[PDB]
């Protein structure tokens, strides 16, 4: 039943992957309202589409800045993948286009804010609350990895909460379709698996390590490896030692020991039984995976909604101009966008 779902999901994906949509709107069709964030690179702006009155979250990248940061291939990855995927816990790409200066990805607006905000304010989530979110990530990675995709930037900053209280994963700036191994140093310090830090070839197991970090951070209120500077975080990550709060359940600690496992032949997600080692673990015994997928499970909380276009679940950011040069920049580099 899972296999049959994923077979169909793959044929759907490959059709779009081999024939990507391009140039499906224009900037002048949107009214810019307010900046919602910054992601891996660029910024995200709340916009309103005039013809429908729908609100969207439009990611904007400056082509010249992308080139300087050596993110050309990663950016083409992001858009090609986003336009091809389809899953309940992935933010949907509605439109993409480019102009002389910038690249634009118009996504669904998810008004509940980043998990990050909610987590820092509350301090920590309960184990049942953490498990509800974690389950959604397990299913999302099951989907993505089946398509030979690695996500590579799991963190609370990238997990938006919808009006049903379910997660949508945003920002695919380091996502890559790769069979076998890859080598790019990318991600966020706290979430990096040891094999990335140590410049080894790595695979989708890095995402399962990152899940460990996330579940820990959600249930503890702080990450398993933290310091004032990245180098000190890396020394902690490669040490082989983790400490759990005394309030963590024995089932939670066992899951985490198997996710935050430096040894790849023992890391959950990466053994012969795949994602089933995680889905069948005792910590998830109360989890009804299909009801999670169907959004039939009652969420831990529902974000406050003040109206269409409300951004009060998001921090305020300095507003910057969307400048469009009269000369085309970087045309060849971004021709497929």
């Amino acid at each position: 039943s899972v296999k049959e779902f994923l077979a169909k999901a793959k044929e759907d994906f490959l059709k779009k992957w081999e024939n990507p949509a391009q140039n499906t709107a224009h900037l002048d069709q949107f009214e810019r309202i307010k900046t919602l964030g910054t992601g891996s690179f660029g910024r995200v702006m709340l916009v309103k589409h005039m013809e429908t009155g729908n609100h969207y979250a439009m990611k904007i990248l400056d082509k010249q800045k992308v080139v300087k940061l050596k993110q050309i291939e990663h950016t083409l990855n992001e858009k090609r993948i986003l336009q091809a995927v389809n899953f309940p816990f992935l933010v949907k790409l509605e439109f993409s286009f480019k102009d002389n200066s910038n690249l634009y990805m118009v996504m669904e607006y998810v008004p509940g804010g980043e998990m990050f905000s909610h987590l820092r304010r509350i301090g920590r989530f309960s184990e049942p609350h953490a498990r509800f979110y974690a389950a959604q990530i397990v299913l999302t990675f099951e989907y993505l990895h089946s398509l030979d995709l690695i996500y590579r930037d799991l963190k609370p900053e990238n997990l938006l909460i919808d009006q049903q209280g379910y997660i949508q994963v945003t920002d695919f700036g380091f996502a890559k379709r790769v069979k076998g191994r890859t080598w790019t140093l990318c991600g966020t310090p706290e979430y990096l698996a040891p094999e990335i830090i140590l410049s080894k070839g790595y695979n989708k197991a890095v995402d399962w390590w990152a899940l460990g970090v996330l579940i820990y951070e959600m249930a503890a209120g702080y990450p398993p490896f933290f310091a004032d500077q990245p180098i000190q975080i890396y020394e902690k990550i490669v040490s082989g030692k983790v400490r759990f709060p005394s309030h963590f359940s024995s089932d939670l600690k066992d899951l985490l020991r198997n996710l935050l496992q430096v040894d790849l032949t023992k890391r959950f997600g990466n053994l012969k039984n795949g994602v089933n080692d995680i889905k069948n673990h005792k910590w998830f015994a109360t989890t009804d995976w299909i009801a999670i997928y169907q959004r039939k499970v009652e969420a831990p909380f529902i974000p406050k909604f003040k109206g269409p276009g409300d951004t009060s679940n998001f921090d305020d950011y300095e507003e910057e101009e969307i400048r469009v040069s009269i000369n085309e920049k970087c045309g060849k580099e971004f021709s497929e966008f």
């Binding site: 910054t38 891996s40 690179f41 940061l69 050596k70 993110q71 980043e114 990050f116 820092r120 301090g123 930037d153 963190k155 900053e157 700036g173 380091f174 790019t184 140093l185 990318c186 991600g187 966020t188 310090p189 706290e190 503890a220 209120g221 702080y222 933290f226 310091a227 004032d228 990245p230 400490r243 709060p245």
Partner: peptide, 20 residues
């Protein structure tokens, strides 16, 4: 406490991605 150490740290806000 570990929580106090975290809250006093410089990495309790939104964290940026790295690259080389």
């Amino acid at each position: 406490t570990t929580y106090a150490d975290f809250i006093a740290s410089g990495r309790t806000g939104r964290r940026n991605a790295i690259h080389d």
